[PDB]
Amino acid sequence: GSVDIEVQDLEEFALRPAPQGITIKCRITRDKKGMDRGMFPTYFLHLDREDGKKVFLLAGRKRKKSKTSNYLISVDPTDLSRGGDSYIGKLRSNLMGTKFTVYDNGVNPQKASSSTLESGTLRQELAAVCYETNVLGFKGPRKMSVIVPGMNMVHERVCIRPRNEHETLLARWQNKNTESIIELQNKTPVWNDDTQSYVLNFHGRVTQASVKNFQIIHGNDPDYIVMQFGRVAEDVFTMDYNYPLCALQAFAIALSSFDSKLACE
């Protein structure tokens, strides 16, 4: 079929998990300024219609709130283009650029009033990414972990609103709490003797693996590609995602790769 993905309300679309059986194909474009006189670059996510037309979905840009520089993800390009701190998603990274968490626009647990703290309105964690650190002797492709909220019987996300440090996605992951989360990982690339490099297979095309070219899958079924991200030009990348991911999660995961410890060349 074709399935002309229905995009009406951008906030709703951004949070909508991709229907099983339908792949949502997008493209991420890097700003209009970029490496200049400071200012961080702005990334744009557009739906790539199979008719040749594009549809703006989200925009992301790094910002320096107080000390750390998180990415604000908004469905309002204009606002973000300036001091517009309006957002639907926020990407937070550790100092090393090895751990990332994506939140919605709810209230931070650590600053919540007693009235809010009753549970509700509290910030949700939509995804977390960990770029595995080198051990010392282990030989092989680096590991990328992606943690997302579990899905319920109706195939909808089971809202994760951490009330404390032990309820975050990264904590549930490290503690093995697999009840309300889904642990995903990058698909292991395979050494190709002709290219003399580790490769991945994007729709039949040999693709050199890197932080700029990867696929996310569930460890139990390597054939089902949850997310496929690849560089097609200097500042242009293709991004396709499938259930259980929504655009905000996929986009955030992609933004993390730009801000990761890796990505240096």
Short mmCIF file of C-alpha atoms in Angstrom, two decimals:
data_model
loop_
_atom_site.label_atom_id
_atom_site.label_comp_id
_atom_site.label_asym_id
_atom_site.label_seq_id
_atom_site.Cartn_x
_atom_site.Cartn_y
_atom_site.Cartn_z
CA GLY A 1 0.00 0.00 0.00
CA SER A 2 0.93 3.65 0.44
CA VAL A 3 -0.65 4.88 3.66
CA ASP A 4 -0.50 8.66 3.32
CA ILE A 5 0.34 9.10 7.01
CA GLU A 6 -2.21 11.51 8.49
CA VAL A 7 -0.50 14.52 10.09
CA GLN A 8 -2.95 17.07 11.48
CA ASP A 9 -2.08 18.16 15.02
CA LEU A 10 1.74 18.17 15.26
CA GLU A 11 1.89 17.57 19.02
CA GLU A 12 -0.46 14.60 18.73
CA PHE A 13 1.42 13.19 15.75
CA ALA A 14 4.76 13.58 17.55
CA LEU A 15 3.57 11.44 20.48
CA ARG A 16 1.77 8.85 18.34
CA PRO A 17 3.45 5.45 18.20
CA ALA A 18 3.87 4.17 14.64
CA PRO A 19 1.13 1.68 13.80
CA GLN A 20 2.46 -1.86 13.60
CA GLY A 21 2.70 -2.62 9.89
CA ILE A 22 3.37 0.97 8.84
CA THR A 23 6.79 2.59 8.57
CA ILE A 24 7.04 6.36 8.95
CA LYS A 25 9.80 7.75 6.73
CA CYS A 26 11.39 11.09 7.62
CA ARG A 27 14.42 13.25 6.99
CA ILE A 28 16.42 15.37 9.43
CA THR A 29 18.01 18.56 8.10
CA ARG A 30 20.74 20.54 9.86
CA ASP A 31 19.90 24.25 10.34
CA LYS A 32 20.42 27.18 7.99
CA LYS A 33 23.35 28.63 9.95
CA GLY A 34 25.26 25.94 11.84
CA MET A 35 28.96 26.32 12.58
CA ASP A 36 29.18 30.11 12.82
CA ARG A 37 29.65 32.61 15.65
CA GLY A 38 28.60 30.36 18.52
CA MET A 39 24.87 29.59 18.21
CA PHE A 40 24.10 25.86 18.18
CA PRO A 41 22.63 24.40 14.97
CA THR A 42 18.90 23.72 14.59
CA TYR A 43 17.73 20.33 13.33
CA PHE A 44 14.48 19.95 11.40
CA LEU A 45 12.40 16.77 11.06
CA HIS A 46 10.11 16.54 8.04
CA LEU A 47 7.80 13.71 7.04
CA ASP A 48 8.94 12.41 3.68
CA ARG A 49 5.76 11.83 1.68
CA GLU A 50 6.17 9.18 -1.02
CA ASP A 51 4.73 11.75 -3.41
CA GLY A 52 7.77 14.01 -3.17
CA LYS A 53 6.31 16.52 -0.72
CA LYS A 54 7.64 17.25 2.75
CA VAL A 55 5.77 18.06 5.97
CA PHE A 56 7.41 19.74 8.97
CA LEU A 57 7.13 17.65 12.14
CA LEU A 58 9.59 18.88 14.77
CA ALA A 59 12.61 21.12 15.29
CA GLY A 60 15.43 20.58 17.76
CA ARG A 61 18.17 22.83 19.10
CA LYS A 62 20.72 22.75 21.90
CA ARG A 63 20.35 25.46 24.54
CA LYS A 64 22.14 26.61 27.70
CA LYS A 65 19.48 27.00 30.41
CA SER A 66 21.59 27.31 33.56
CA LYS A 67 24.74 25.24 33.07
CA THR A 68 23.95 22.16 30.98
CA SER A 69 23.01 22.46 27.31
CA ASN A 70 19.87 20.42 26.63
CA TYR A 71 18.01 20.20 23.32
CA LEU A 72 14.50 21.63 23.25
CA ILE A 73 12.21 19.86 20.76
CA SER A 74 9.28 21.96 19.52
CA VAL A 75 6.51 21.92 16.90
CA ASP A 76 6.96 25.71 16.59
CA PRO A 77 10.03 26.44 14.40
CA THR A 78 9.73 30.22 14.63
CA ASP A 79 9.57 30.35 18.44
CA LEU A 80 12.63 28.12 18.77
CA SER A 81 14.53 30.23 16.22
CA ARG A 82 14.78 32.75 19.05
CA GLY A 83 14.64 32.60 22.83
CA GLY A 84 11.50 30.52 22.49
CA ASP A 85 11.72 27.95 25.27
CA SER A 86 8.38 26.42 24.28
CA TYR A 87 8.70 22.66 23.83
CA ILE A 88 7.11 19.23 23.63
CA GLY A 89 10.31 17.34 24.39
CA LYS A 90 13.61 17.97 26.17
CA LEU A 91 16.82 15.99 25.72
CA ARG A 92 19.19 15.83 28.69
CA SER A 93 22.71 14.40 28.51
CA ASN A 94 25.28 13.51 31.15
CA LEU A 95 28.62 15.33 31.09
CA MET A 96 30.36 12.54 29.17
CA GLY A 97 27.74 12.46 26.43
CA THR A 98 27.18 8.75 27.03
CA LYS A 99 23.78 8.81 28.71
CA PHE A 100 20.68 10.65 27.52
CA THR A 101 17.09 11.01 28.65
CA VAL A 102 14.18 12.50 26.73
CA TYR A 103 11.37 14.11 28.74
CA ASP A 104 8.00 15.53 27.75
CA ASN A 105 7.02 19.00 29.00
CA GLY A 106 5.68 17.89 32.38
CA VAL A 107 6.92 19.19 35.74
CA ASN A 108 10.33 18.14 37.04
CA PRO A 109 9.90 15.85 40.12
CA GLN A 110 12.64 17.69 41.98
CA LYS A 111 10.85 21.03 41.73
CA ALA A 112 7.23 19.91 42.02
CA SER A 113 4.80 21.44 44.50
CA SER A 114 3.11 19.19 47.06
CA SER A 115 -0.15 19.74 45.17
CA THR A 116 1.33 18.45 41.92
CA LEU A 117 3.35 15.69 43.58
CA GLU A 118 0.12 13.79 44.23
CA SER A 119 1.03 12.24 40.88
CA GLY A 120 -0.21 13.73 37.64
CA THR A 121 1.29 16.55 35.59
CA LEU A 122 4.66 15.11 36.57
CA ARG A 123 7.24 14.92 33.80
CA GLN A 124 7.30 11.70 31.78
CA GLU A 125 10.45 10.04 30.47
CA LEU A 126 9.93 9.03 26.83
CA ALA A 127 13.28 7.44 26.03
CA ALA A 128 16.82 6.98 27.25
CA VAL A 129 19.97 6.17 25.31
CA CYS A 130 23.29 4.82 26.55
CA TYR A 131 26.38 4.68 24.36
CA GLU A 132 28.37 1.79 25.91
CA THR A 133 31.80 2.68 27.23
CA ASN A 134 34.86 0.77 26.06
CA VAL A 135 35.83 -1.97 28.51
CA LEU A 136 39.52 -2.76 27.92
CA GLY A 137 40.27 -5.63 25.57
CA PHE A 138 36.78 -6.24 24.24
CA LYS A 139 37.07 -6.34 20.46
CA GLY A 140 34.00 -5.59 18.39
CA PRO A 141 31.35 -3.01 17.38
CA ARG A 142 30.30 -0.55 20.09
CA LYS A 143 26.95 -1.04 21.80
CA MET A 144 24.08 1.44 21.82
CA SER A 145 21.17 0.87 24.22
CA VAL A 146 17.75 2.52 23.88
CA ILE A 147 15.20 2.30 26.68
CA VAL A 148 11.57 3.25 26.18
CA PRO A 149 8.32 2.93 28.18
CA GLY A 150 6.51 -0.36 27.80
CA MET A 151 3.27 -0.58 25.87
CA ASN A 152 -0.07 -1.71 27.31
CA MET A 153 -2.72 -4.16 26.09
CA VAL A 154 -4.14 -1.44 23.85
CA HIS A 155 -0.68 -0.85 22.35
CA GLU A 156 -0.29 2.57 23.93
CA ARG A 157 2.62 3.78 26.02
CA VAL A 158 2.48 3.05 29.73
CA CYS A 159 3.28 6.51 31.07
CA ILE A 160 6.46 6.60 33.13
CA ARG A 161 6.48 9.58 35.51
CA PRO A 162 9.47 9.13 37.84
CA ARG A 163 8.74 10.20 41.41
CA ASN A 164 12.34 9.44 42.35
CA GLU A 165 15.73 8.43 40.99
CA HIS A 166 14.84 4.72 41.06
CA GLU A 167 11.90 5.14 38.72
CA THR A 168 13.69 6.73 35.77
CA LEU A 169 14.18 4.77 32.55
CA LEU A 170 17.94 4.46 32.99
CA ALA A 171 17.44 3.16 36.54
CA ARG A 172 14.79 0.60 35.61
CA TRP A 173 17.23 -0.52 32.93
CA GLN A 174 20.29 -0.86 35.16
CA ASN A 175 18.19 -2.52 37.90
CA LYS A 176 16.65 -5.00 35.44
CA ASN A 177 13.11 -3.74 36.08
CA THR A 178 11.79 -5.01 32.74
CA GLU A 179 8.09 -4.79 33.62
CA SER A 180 7.32 -1.29 32.38
CA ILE A 181 10.16 -0.79 29.90
CA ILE A 182 11.35 -2.04 26.53
CA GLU A 183 15.08 -2.51 26.05
CA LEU A 184 16.24 -1.90 22.48
CA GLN A 185 19.77 -1.88 21.03
CA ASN A 186 21.66 -1.07 17.86
CA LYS A 187 21.73 -3.92 15.35
CA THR A 188 25.19 -5.50 15.37
CA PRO A 189 27.12 -4.55 12.21
CA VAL A 190 29.10 -7.27 10.43
CA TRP A 191 32.66 -7.09 9.14
CA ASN A 192 32.68 -7.03 5.33
CA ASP A 193 35.90 -8.24 3.68
CA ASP A 194 35.34 -6.22 0.50
CA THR A 195 34.92 -2.88 2.26
CA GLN A 196 37.32 -3.73 5.06
CA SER A 197 34.91 -2.28 7.62
CA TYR A 198 31.90 -3.14 9.76
CA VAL A 199 28.71 -2.74 7.74
CA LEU A 200 24.92 -2.66 8.10
CA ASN A 201 22.28 -3.47 5.50
CA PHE A 202 19.92 -0.55 4.75
CA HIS A 203 17.31 -1.82 2.31
CA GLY A 204 19.89 -4.04 0.62
CA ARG A 205 22.59 -1.36 0.52
CA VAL A 206 25.95 -2.03 2.21
CA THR A 207 26.31 0.81 4.71
CA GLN A 208 29.37 1.65 6.79
CA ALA A 209 28.38 1.51 10.43
CA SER A 210 28.97 4.50 12.69
CA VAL A 211 27.11 6.77 15.10
CA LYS A 212 25.83 8.43 11.90
CA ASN A 213 24.49 5.19 10.39
CA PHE A 214 22.64 2.78 12.63
CA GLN A 215 19.57 0.64 13.16
CA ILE A 216 17.69 0.05 16.40
CA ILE A 217 16.08 -3.36 17.08
CA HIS A 218 14.83 -5.55 19.89
CA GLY A 219 17.53 -8.06 20.80
CA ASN A 220 15.07 -10.93 20.30
CA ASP A 221 14.26 -10.16 16.67
CA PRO A 222 17.12 -8.54 14.66
CA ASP A 223 15.04 -8.64 11.47
CA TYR A 224 12.44 -6.13 12.68
CA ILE A 225 13.99 -2.66 12.32
CA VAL A 226 12.43 -0.38 14.94
CA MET A 227 14.49 2.60 13.76
CA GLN A 228 16.80 3.21 10.79
CA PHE A 229 19.05 6.27 10.73
CA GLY A 230 21.54 7.14 8.01
CA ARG A 231 23.48 10.03 6.51
CA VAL A 232 22.56 10.87 2.92
CA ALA A 233 24.40 14.20 2.68
CA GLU A 234 26.56 16.52 4.78
CA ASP A 235 23.65 17.96 6.75
CA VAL A 236 20.87 15.58 5.72
CA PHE A 237 19.88 12.26 7.27
CA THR A 238 17.05 9.81 6.67
CA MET A 239 15.15 8.52 9.69
CA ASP A 240 12.47 5.83 9.51
CA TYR A 241 10.70 4.41 12.54
CA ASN A 242 8.22 1.66 13.42
CA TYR A 243 6.13 0.52 16.38
CA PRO A 244 6.55 1.04 19.29
CA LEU A 245 8.27 4.39 18.57
CA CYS A 246 6.70 7.78 17.97
CA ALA A 247 8.43 10.63 16.11
CA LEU A 248 9.46 12.49 19.26
CA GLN A 249 11.27 9.39 20.60
CA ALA A 250 12.96 8.65 17.27
CA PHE A 251 13.96 12.26 16.70
CA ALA A 252 15.34 12.50 20.24
CA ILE A 253 17.34 9.29 19.81
CA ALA A 254 18.75 10.71 16.58
CA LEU A 255 19.64 14.04 18.23
CA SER A 256 21.50 12.09 20.90
CA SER A 257 23.81 10.65 18.24
CA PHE A 258 24.81 14.19 17.16
CA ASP A 259 25.59 15.07 20.78
CA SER A 260 27.21 11.74 21.72
CA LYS A 261 30.79 11.29 22.91
CA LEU A 262 31.39 9.68 19.53
CA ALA A 263 30.60 11.59 16.33
CA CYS A 264 34.00 13.19 15.77
CA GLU A 265 35.18 13.38 12.16
#
